[PDB]
């Protein structure tokens, strides 16, 4: 994440680190982020699995705050490590343009939720698309600056602003490349944004009067990182409740949706 500071242990217990496991040397490399939905599913970005669709090219790390580049050493609790049992890229995903960039991963064996690992919430059917203004945060182990080979060993976080799509799409910004299933978040002057390695990660929001945060998007792409008028483009989770529910089950999704509590 370009900008923003490090996070504190337990601050975001649904963060999962998708890694690529080179078998010819047991090295693990963090390449994408992800969101813990339940004991056995993780929501992520589709593009992540490009040229990597074999369930054994991956390893999942939960309950982490500090992530090390290529490492072979096992992970000691509370950190957890897991294997991919399934990779479900969205049926109408479009590579390249990064459309319907959303995927689901089934874990094996399942993870135990504790002080450093628990689910995140998704929007309610009733939600509709993210209305600005609002206070959102993004987290991730990606680059700290456009390019710059090294990723962040310590999970980072940053506060960002939702931008209307009519603005995000205007000529002087993305000039048409944005669609209704997207969500743009960042700043007009940039400086703060996600970046490679953050992909698959969450865009969480809520209102000043509200208690809990909610994953309203998955980091998808953008033009560089932290550039003027080029906000990060995210996959709006709301329009995919639909698909999510058809893969993970109704109740499962129900359990990750806030009710109508006190305001």
């Amino acid at each position: 994440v370009v900008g923003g500071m490090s996070a504190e242990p337990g601050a975001w217990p649904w963060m999962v680190s998708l890694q690529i496991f080179m078998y010819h040397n047991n090295r693990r490399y963090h390449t994408c982020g992800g969101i813990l939905l339940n004991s056995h599913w993780v929501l992520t970005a589709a593009h992540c699995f490009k040229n990597k669709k074999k369930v054994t090219d991956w390893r999942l790390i939960f309950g982490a705050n500090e992530v090390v580049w290529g490492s072979n050493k096992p992970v000691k609790p509370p950190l957890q490590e897991r294997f991919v049992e399934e990779i479900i890229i969205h049926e109408k995903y479009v590579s390249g343009l990064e459309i319907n960039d959303i995927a689901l991963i089934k874990i094996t064996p399942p993870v135990p939720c504790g002080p450093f690992i628990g689910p995140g919430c998704l929007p309610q059917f009733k939600a509709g698309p993210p209305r600005a203004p609002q206070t959102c945060w993004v987290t991730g182990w990606g680059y700290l600056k456009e390019k710059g080979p090294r990723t962040s060993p310590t999970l980072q976080e940053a506060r960002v602003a939702l931008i209307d799509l009519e603005l995000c799409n205007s000529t002087r910004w993305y000039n048409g490349r944005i669609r209704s299933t997207n969500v743009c978040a960042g700043y007009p002057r940039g400086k703060i944004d996600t970046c490679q390695g953050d992909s698959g990660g969450p865009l969480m929001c809520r209102d000043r009067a509200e208690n809990t945060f909610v994953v309203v998007g998955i980091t998808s792409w953008g033009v560089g990182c932290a550039r003027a008028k080029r906000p990060g483009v995210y996959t709006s989770t709301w329009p995919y409740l639909n698909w999510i529910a058809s893969k993970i089950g109704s109740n499962a999704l129900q359990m990750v949706q806030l009710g109508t509590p006190p305001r």
């Binding site: 242990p9 337990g10 601050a11 975001w12 217990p13 813990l36 339940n38 004991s39 056995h40 399942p110 993870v111 135990p112 939720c113 504790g114 002080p115 450093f116 690992i117 628990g118 689910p119 995140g120 919430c121 809990t212 945060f213 909610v214 359990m255 990750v256 949706q257 806030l258």
Partner: peptide, 13 residues
């Protein structure tokens, strides 16, 4: 240590 329960819960610590 089920993963059910209220979501969006932070600092479970």
């Amino acid at each position: 240590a089920t993963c059910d329960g209220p979501c969006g819960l932070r600092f479970r610590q």
